[PDB]
């Protein structure tokens, strides 16, 4: 009774009961930048499974898209918003259906896997069994079981993908909507982001005072960094390929991206009024499963941001509402 | 050190293992405002049981203090920041060691109860199991066992404090931090958020559009709500009076006011530059136990703010660093 309401038109045209069920992975990425992206041409091979499927034609990229700020805290919660970045009001965010919501209310069956920190809010509405702490081992009181292959003992991404089949089974004949929240590539720290199988680019930096280090070795574990999430993103698509019953999306786009020594600038977290490019410049992909009924959206005069993600998801699952009229999305809607 | 940090030098003068165990409950309160308690002048009887607890000079009321924002996204993060609101970027709150970190590193065990939404972030780097969601039930994903007093089925905020003696019987011979995030005032649907005995001041509103409402019905409501924190806070009390095996200190701030139709504005969220001084003015009160070692500070001339906080826990806890020196606290440290 207590929401501020955005999509209340909002029905599904179609259902799980008279077509496939829909089942989409989003995968909220963590201060992943555009142009060091092997895809988006950066010199490096950052991304060599995600390359490959662009090959194929069955990812698409969508370039250098703009985030609506430098921090998970202004970012996430928008990401999810029907407000968008122009009228998001990173205080009052929480007072306002988000598209999470809408989903929830018509049948779609959410869970939120977070290995980064939280949802931002956008889950609280939404019953606590259907968010999961991942960034915390079971003794921890959390879930990750895949926190002990490296000596800082953090909990990594691919924890996340462990048993999704849980899930899926609980809800048969249901859409689902599944959201991954990853550590990706948070900084300064960025040697301890990876397995060793992905300490590639080499030498590193192994000191969280950046500026000590040489830039060309803080560089290099970020893009180390980077492999392990290219990783993580095949292992997704791979568990998603499996799921032949559902036709299958898997949406990725970082909240922010990452200073890198220019102009002497590292990190992020700026003001977005003076932050500089590489704080807003984020990759975003999407993956579609065998025989998609889906069309890509070609990129638009204005390129995309995190604003078209709201209209996407609604999208990938058939839902009308006049709420996202005229809305760039990643996705057209089907008729 | 991935952690900007404020407190590195902070030690403990004394521990558990020389004098009493130190025992502090925190209530982080929600949408109360200073001018409608009886304790600090309200023509109306809505703190009954803190009112005799302030006649008998067991509970200190601070008067009008001043909340840091207007919304708990921003004011509950800064309550546990050593920033203080002059320097506090909610955005970035996260990057920098807060005062519960501090505690937790020096050997405090802290518990973290969350009737409201979440600890807004602070409670991010300690164990998942520190923290214990109490706005679902046990079969939402949730600990709250008063949830279904009501035909809301609204977790109550006195289910936060079934069974505190397992954090107390787990933890001898440490010294003990209980915060307690309420659901207390919140709107607009204030009759939602008290069980019946409390439906004192009557009539009430009964809908969420307070415009449509006469006013006094919405006010009523609202000092209905307000009685059923100050029986939450007796209760609160009375848990802490029994632990005579410790040094015992219950601390209440709100996390901001409330506007209620002065000059036609409701609800709160409004910019801290330009909001009215009914969404930043809030309660502040201080119990402490039998034989206490502490004393109130003098009051700053302004009158006490939510910056208060992280100095106040450090001194209750006994913890020397000079990130409290020429900073205001409710109770002055011992030496
Ligand atoms: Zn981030
Ligand atoms: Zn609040």
């Known amino acids: ?38 895809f988006n041409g950066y010199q490096r091979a950052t991304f060599p499974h995600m390359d490959k499927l662009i090959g194929l034609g069955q990812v698409h990229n969508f370039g250098n898209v703009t985030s609506c700020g ?25 007072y306002h259906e ?10 779609v069956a959410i869970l939120w896997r977070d290995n980064n920190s939280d949802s931002k809010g956008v889950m609280n509405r939404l019953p606590a069994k259907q968010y999961q702490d991942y960034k915390n081992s079971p003794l921890q ?7 002990h292959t490296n000596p800082y003992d953090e909990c990594r991404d691919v924890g996340m993908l462990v048993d999704l089949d849980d899930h899926v089974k609980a809800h048969a004949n249901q859409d689902i909507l599944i959201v991954l929240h990853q550590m990706g590539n948070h900084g300064p720290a960025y ?35 980077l ?24 949406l990725y786009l970082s909240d922010h991206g990452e200073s890198l020594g220019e102009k002497g600038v590292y990190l992020h977290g700026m003001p977005k009024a003076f932050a500089p490019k590489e704080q807003l410049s984020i990759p975003a992909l999407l993956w579609l499963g065998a025989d998609t ?7 638009p005069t204005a390129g995309f941001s995190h604003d078209a993600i709201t209209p996407t998801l609604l999208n990938l699952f058939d839902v009308s509402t006049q709420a996202t009229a005229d809305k760039t999305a990643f996705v057209n809607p089907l008729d």
């Open 191 to 225: 040697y301890k982001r990876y397995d060793d199988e992905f300490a590639q680019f080499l030498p590193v930096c192994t000191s969280s005072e950046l500026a000590e280090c040489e830039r060309q070795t803080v560089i290099n574990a970020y893009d180390n960094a």
């Open 227 to 250: 492999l392990a999430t290219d990783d993580f993103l095949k292992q997704t698509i791979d568990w998603l390929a499996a799921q032949t019953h559902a036709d299958t999306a898997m």
């Open 141 to 147: 009181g959390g879930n990750n079981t895949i926190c």
């Open 98 to 107: 988000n598209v999470i919501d809408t989903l929830d209310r018509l049948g």
């Open 70 to 94: 430098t921090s998970a805290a202004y970012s996430v919660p928008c990401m999810f918003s029907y407000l968008g970045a122009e009228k998001y009001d990173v205080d009052t965010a929480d």
């Open 293 to 299: 009924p889906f069309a890509v959206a070609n990129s």
């Open 1 to 38: 009774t207590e929401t501020i309401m955005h999509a209340n038109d909002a029905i599904q045209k179609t259902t799980a009961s008279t077509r496939k069920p829909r089942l989409v992975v989003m995968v909220v990425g963590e201060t992943a930048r555009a142009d060091h992206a092997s």
